[PDB]
Amino acid sequence: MRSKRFEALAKRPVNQDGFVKEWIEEGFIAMESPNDPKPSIKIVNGAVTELDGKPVSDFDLIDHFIARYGINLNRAEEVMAMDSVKLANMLCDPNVKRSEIVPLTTAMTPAKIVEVVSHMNVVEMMMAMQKMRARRTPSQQAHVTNVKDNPVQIAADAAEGAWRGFDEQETTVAVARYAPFNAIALLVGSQVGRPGVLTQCSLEEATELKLGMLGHTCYAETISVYGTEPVFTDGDDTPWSKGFLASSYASRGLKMRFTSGSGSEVQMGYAEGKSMLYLEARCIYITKAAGVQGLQNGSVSCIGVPSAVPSGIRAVLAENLICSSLDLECASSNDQTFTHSDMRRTARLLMQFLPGTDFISSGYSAVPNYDNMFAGSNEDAEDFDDYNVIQRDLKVDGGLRPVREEDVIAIRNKAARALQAVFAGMGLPPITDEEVEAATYAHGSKDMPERNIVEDIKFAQEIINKNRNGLEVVKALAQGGFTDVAQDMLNIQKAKLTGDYLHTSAIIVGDGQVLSAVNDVNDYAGPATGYRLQGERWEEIKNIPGALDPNE
């Protein structure tokens, strides 16, 4: 008969996860495949004639783009000749400066840097990531969505997320034509919670750029790249169309990054027999080659693919490390559900949380996952207190902080009242006092009164059709009792004029201070150097609810 021990284990949530054995021939292998090309490069008169065993006669569009733009040819032959274990050793050695490594790693071919990081265990990878992360200060990015596209709730949730510490926040839509409302609500709410928080509204590429041009977003992220030409082509793009789109955003003063992540190519069935990590390296080099400042990767929405196979979560840390080692900002996923097990998803998160990345998650859900319109994140709002407890336990700055319920109520109320004034001043379907109250105290859209969706969609569409721009939102705030929020909104728009926040890892902190890898240079050099959680920031992270005062 059956062992009751094994019946008990059969019930465990982890055994509902999807697992598969490796299939090397088809590329269903996270990393360290015997099919991956051996690193190589040949250069004649400044042109690459061979890239990782492939002659230039056989280059696809990705090889051409990487060989022409993605590799520093000044030291490529030099670094190719170095022992890959020695290079991996340099990555995690505290006494080899990031600034000494970057000229070497940015001269590596895609196969070379994969070979280097594949010599590392996850402790070594984290030891390296804390050094190779571009921005000295780690940060965090949140999802702010709900299944009704309720704009009052989006504004209130965005204010709370900004109050808790997210420096980038991201929305998207359940119903496509709601998008202008979601974007405005996210931007207004974010500035109420903390002036300087950057916002994006992830959509079809043309609509998202239009909202940027109108001033209702601050950056874009979900512009995808892929690691084989068939998959890239089946997404209806090339490296050149993506590079042109990237420069188009910058020409409007909008920060942007690409999105990639391990497993996308084998998921589509066109892995060309290569490991997920090697193909993700090609995606990372396309990003580098396009001149894009950063990258959202770490499998992202494909996470069920590497997580199914051996060493898949290690491969996910590795692809984040390659990104940072190639001197790109890394928005390191942790933004998509992949497991039923709290144990398993914590281990997956800690790989990026413990060393810190530019954004530890590229989409921590700042709403309960039932409201998450990216189909659920690796962490959600009900995890906020656990996240803060682990920061305090380990003395690790994960970018967030404990907050008082009365402060959150007040900031959510202000955001909802500010958006109410925006909608009144702009002649949009009204936000009632009852809606402001509901959004103040809501956990999610289950707590929100239903809106007239037909009316919202008509007026949201007219924002696009009539080219209603962000200065009209500033005007509505300034004439509706919110000149303070109006000024913060205007200040976000003025940041697009300077180009400062276009740079690698840029966020805006304090009183409009841009903080990027240019002026917040990561200077890690071992213990007691580099970013350290200390001072008032440590006092903030210590102050969790429930800590009994011995003087009481």
Binding site: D60, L61, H64, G70, N72, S99, V102, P103, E205, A206, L209, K210, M213, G215, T233, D236, D237, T238, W240, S241, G243, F244, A246, S247, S248, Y249, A250, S251, R252, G253, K288, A289, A290, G291, V292, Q293, D327, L471, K475, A478, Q479, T483, Q487, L490, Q493, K494, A495, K496, L497, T498, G499, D500, L502, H503, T504, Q513, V514, A517, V518, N519
Partner: protein
């Protein structure tokens, strides 16, 4: 400009002008509310982008700098034309002569020399990799 010149908003705000020759200090609530500044005033300039490209180079990021140099050229290209060129670069959308015509127009109408070479490069490689109209 060098990394010590960054952020421009801190180190050289006066260097930052708009396409309509406004300054950062012109963008006040009072001027917004009176329409003394408008959305057409609020556009980053090619001068600002080329300054940021110089800062990116000095920070060790040559490819990011090249992106900003392309961006500087594209400030002069209208919103609708931006999307047309992006679409034209998607696989199977354009003939080779249509892409070369976009590049000649970029160069002669907008002085967008770098972007023009970028599009001519795509045209040449789309021939080799069979990504032009009629190749699917």
């Amino acid at each position: 400009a060098r990394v010590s010149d960054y952020p421009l908003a801190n180190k050289h705000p006066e260097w930052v002008k708009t396409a309509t020759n406004k300054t950062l200090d012109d963008f006040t609530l009072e001027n917004v509310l009176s329409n003394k500044v408008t959305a057409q005033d609020m556009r980053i300039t090619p001068e600002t982008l080329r300054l940021q490209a110089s800062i990116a180079k000095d920070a060790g990021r040559d490819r990011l700098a090249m992106n900003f140099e392309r961006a500087a050229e594209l400030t002069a290209v209208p919103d609708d034309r931006i999307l047309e060129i992006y679409n034209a670069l998607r696989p199977y959308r354009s003939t080779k002569e249509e892409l070369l015509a976009i590049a000649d127009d970029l160069e002669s109408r907008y002085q967008a020399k770098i972007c023009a070479a970028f599009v001519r490069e795509a045209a040449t490689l789309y021939v080799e990799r069979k990504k032009l109209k009629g190749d699917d």
